[PDB]
Scaffold this active site. Structure first.
Site, PDB file in Angstrom:
ATOM      1  N   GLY A 263      -2.437  -0.148  47.460  1.00  0.00           N
ATOM      2  CA  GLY A 263      -2.526   1.395  47.913  1.00  0.00           C
ATOM      3  C   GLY A 263      -1.506   1.373  47.429  1.00  0.00           C
ATOM      4  N   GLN A 264      -1.432   3.053  47.669  1.00  0.00           N
ATOM      5  CA  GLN A 264      -0.111   3.915  47.309  1.00  0.00           C
ATOM      6  C   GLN A 264      -0.219   4.842  48.335  1.00  0.00           C
ATOM      7  OE1 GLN A 264      -2.632   6.440  45.170  1.00  0.00           O
ATOM      8  NE2 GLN A 264      -0.485   7.667  44.364  1.00  0.00           N
TER       9      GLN A 264
ATOM     10  N   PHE B  24       6.341   7.391  48.303  1.00  0.00           N
ATOM     11  CA  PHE B  24       7.275   6.695  47.594  1.00  0.00           C
ATOM     12  C   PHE B  24       7.114   6.096  47.351  1.00  0.00           C
ATOM     13  CE2 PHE B  24       8.958   9.325  51.673  1.00  0.00           C
ATOM     14  CZ  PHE B  24       8.089   8.866  52.752  1.00  0.00           C
TER      15      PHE B  24
ATOM     16  N   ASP C 204       8.345   3.833  65.218  1.00  0.00           N
ATOM     17  CA  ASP C 204       7.033   4.084  64.216  1.00  0.00           C
ATOM     18  C   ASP C 204       5.857   2.859  64.253  1.00  0.00           C
ATOM     19  OD1 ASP C 204       6.416   5.566  62.100  1.00  0.00           O
ATOM     20  OD2 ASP C 204       7.101   5.050  60.537  1.00  0.00           O
TER      21      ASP C 204
HETATM   22  C1  LIG Z   1       4.167  -4.869  51.329  1.00  0.00           C
HETATM   23  C2  LIG Z   1       3.344  -5.232  53.091  1.00  0.00           C
HETATM   24  N1  LIG Z   1       2.453  -5.853  53.063  1.00  0.00           N
HETATM   25  C3  LIG Z   1       1.895  -7.022  52.787  1.00  0.00           C
HETATM   26  N2  LIG Z   1       0.431  -6.954  52.163  1.00  0.00           N
HETATM   27  C4  LIG Z   1      -0.065  -5.968  52.666  1.00  0.00           C
HETATM   28  C5  LIG Z   1      -0.980  -5.324  51.807  1.00  0.00           C
HETATM   29  N3  LIG Z   1      -2.086  -5.948  51.746  1.00  0.00           N
HETATM   30  C6  LIG Z   1      -3.448  -5.493  51.957  1.00  0.00           C
HETATM   31  C7  LIG Z   1      -3.994  -4.492  52.188  1.00  0.00           C
HETATM   32  C8  LIG Z   1      -5.647  -4.127  51.414  1.00  0.00           C
HETATM   33  C9  LIG Z   1      -6.062  -5.176  51.143  1.00  0.00           C
HETATM   34  P1  LIG Z   1      -7.417  -4.718  50.533  1.00  0.00           P
HETATM   35  O1  LIG Z   1      -8.297  -3.403  50.138  1.00  0.00           O
HETATM   36  O2  LIG Z   1      -8.167  -5.929  49.696  1.00  0.00           O
HETATM   37  C10 LIG Z   1      -8.886  -4.633  51.621  1.00  0.00           C
HETATM   38  P2  LIG Z   1     -10.402  -5.286  52.144  1.00  0.00           P
HETATM   39  O3  LIG Z   1     -10.924  -3.755  52.719  1.00  0.00           O
HETATM   40  O4  LIG Z   1     -11.063  -5.666  50.426  1.00  0.00           O
HETATM   41  O5  LIG Z   1     -10.615  -6.092  52.866  1.00  0.00           O
HETATM   42  C11 LIG Z   1      -5.603  -6.594  50.607  1.00  0.00           C
HETATM   43  C12 LIG Z   1      -4.663  -6.781  51.317  1.00  0.00           C
HETATM   44  N4  LIG Z   1      -1.495  -3.996  52.475  1.00  0.00           N
HETATM   45  C13 LIG Z   1      -0.271  -3.374  52.211  1.00  0.00           C
HETATM   46  C14 LIG Z   1      -0.425  -1.539  53.032  1.00  0.00           C
HETATM   47  C15 LIG Z   1      -0.997  -1.276  51.030  1.00  0.00           C
HETATM   48  C16 LIG Z   1      -1.338   0.313  51.396  1.00  0.00           C
HETATM   49  C17 LIG Z   1      -2.302   0.871  52.422  1.00  0.00           C
HETATM   50  N5  LIG Z   1      -1.927   2.374  52.910  1.00  0.00           N
HETATM   51  C18 LIG Z   1      -1.379   0.137  53.926  1.00  0.00           C
HETATM   52  C19 LIG Z   1      -0.801  -0.650  53.724  1.00  0.00           C
HETATM   53  N6  LIG Z   1       1.541  -3.665  52.796  1.00  0.00           N
HETATM   54  C20 LIG Z   1       1.350  -5.000  52.657  1.00  0.00           C
END
Ligand SMILES: CCn1cnc2c(Nc3ccc(P(=O)(O)CP(=O)(O)O)cc3)nc([C@H]3CC[C@H](N)CC3)nc21
Length: 261
Positions: A18-19, A22, A130
Site C-alpha cells: 500500500g501507499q 507519509f 486511533d
Molecule cells: C506494516 C504492518 N503490516 C503488516 N502487514 C501489512 C499489510 N499486509 C497486506 C496488505 C494487503 C495485502 P493484499 O492487497 O494482497 C490483499 P488481497 O486483497 O489480495 O487479499 C496483503 C498484505 N498491509 C499493511 C497496510 C498496507 C497499506 C494499506 N492501506 C493498509 C494496510 N500493513 C501491514
C-alpha cells in the site's frame, strides 16, 4: 542507535502492499529467512522522530493480538520492520468480495481478538487513540491484530470514531478507546460502512452531545448493540473495560446468545 537497529542490507522490499502520504508499505524479506512488512518514510512528509515514535511505542508493547515490531532502520529513508499480516486491513477485508460471506460468529470472534489486543493495551496503561477497522490487520485464519501505534501513549481526530470528551477536551483514556471500539463494532456488523451514515463531522459531534447513538445495525442482535451502547455511555467511567469486552465476546454464543441460529 538502539537495540532494534538493523543493517538496511538485511532487508529486501518486494511487493508494494500500500501507499499513504507519509510513505508506503512493502512486503519484504529480512535476513533472507524472514517474511516481513516494511513501512517507509517519504523524506519530506514528517520528521524522522515523528514517524519513528510509532515504533517507540511498539518497543514497550508485545502481545499476540498487536502487530509486532521486528526492527528499524533510522537513517533516511527510515524503515519500520514489522510482522507481516497476509490479508491486509480489516476495513478493506470487510469491504471486499472476501468479507461478503463473513457471518456473525466470525465477526464476533474478530471483535473478541481485537478486544484481547486492547485488553493488553488497557493493562499496560496505554491509550491507542486511533482505534478503528482501518487500523486492524487481518492474517491467515482470520487472525486480527491491532496496528498503527503512532498516536498511542502512556496515560501519564475523527469525531466519528473518537469519544466526545477526547475530541472536545483532549481527554484521552482507555475509556475513549472503549468508545472507539463500540464504533468499530458497527463497522464489523455492517461490512465496513462509515459510521453515522449521511452525517457530516459537525453533525456527528453535535448529535452525539445531545445523546444520539447509532441504532442497531440490521442482522445485529440487540444484545450486541447494547454492548455498543455501553461503550458509548457519555460518562467515560460507565463504559466497560476491554477485559470485560474480551470475555463477553469470547463467551457470546453460550452466555449471551445461546439460541442463535
Ligand atoms: C506494516 C504492518 N503490516 C503488516 N502487514 C501489512 C499489510 N499486509 C497486506 C496488505 C494487503 C495485502 P493484499 O492487497 O494482497 C490483499 P488481497 O486483497 O489480495 O487479499 C496483503 C498484505 N498491509 C499493511 C497496510 C498496507 C497499506 C494499506 N492501506 C493498509 C494496510 N500493513 C501491514
Amino acid at each position: 542507535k538502539d537495540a532494534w537497529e538493523i543493517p538496511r542490507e538485511s532487508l529486501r522490499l518486494e511487493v508494494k502492499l500500500g501507499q499513504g502520504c507519509f510513505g508506503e508499505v512493502w512486503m519484504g524479506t529480512w535476513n533472507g529467512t524472514t517474511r516481513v512488512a516494511i513501512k517507509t518514510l517519504k523524506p519530506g512528509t514528517m520528521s524522522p522522530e515523528a514517524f519513528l515514535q510509532e515504533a517507540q511505542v511498539m518497543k514497550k508493547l508485545r502481545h499476540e493480538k498487536l502487530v509486532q515490531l521486528y526492527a528499524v532502520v533510522s537513517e533516511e529513508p527510515i524503515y519500520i520492520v514489522t510482522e507481516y499480516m497476509s490479508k491486509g486491513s480489516l476495513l478493506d477485508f470487510l469491504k471486499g468480495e472476501t468479507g461478503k460471506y463473513l457471518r456473525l460468529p466470525q465477526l464476533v470472534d474478530m471483535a473478541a481478538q481485537i478486544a484481547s489486543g486492547m485488553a493488553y493495551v488497557e493493562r499496560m496503561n496505554y491509550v491507542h487513540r486511533d482505534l478503528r477497522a482501518a487500523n486492524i490487520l487481518v492474517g491467515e485464519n482470520l487472525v486480527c491484530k491491532v496496528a498503527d501505534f503512532g498516536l498511542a501513549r502512556l496515560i501519564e481526530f475523527p469525531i466519528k470514531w473518537t469519544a466526545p470528551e477526547a475530541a472536545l477536551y483532549g481527554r484521552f483514556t482507555i475509556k475513549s478507546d472503549v468508545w472507539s471500539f463500540g464504533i468499530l463494532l458497527t463497522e464489523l456488523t455492517t461490512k465496513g460502512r462509515v459510521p453515522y451514515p449521511g452525517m457530516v463531522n459537525r453533525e456527528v459531534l453535535d448529535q452525539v452531545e445531545r445523546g444520539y447513538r447509532m441504532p442497531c445495525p440490521p442482522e445485529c442482535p440487540e444484545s450486541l448493540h447494547d454492548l455498543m451502547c455501553q461503550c458509548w455511555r457519555k460518562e467515560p467511567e460507565e463504559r466497560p473495560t476491554f477485559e470485560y469486552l474480551q470475555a463477553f465476546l469470547e463467551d457470546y454464543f453460550t452466555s449471551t446468545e445461546p439460541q442463535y441460529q
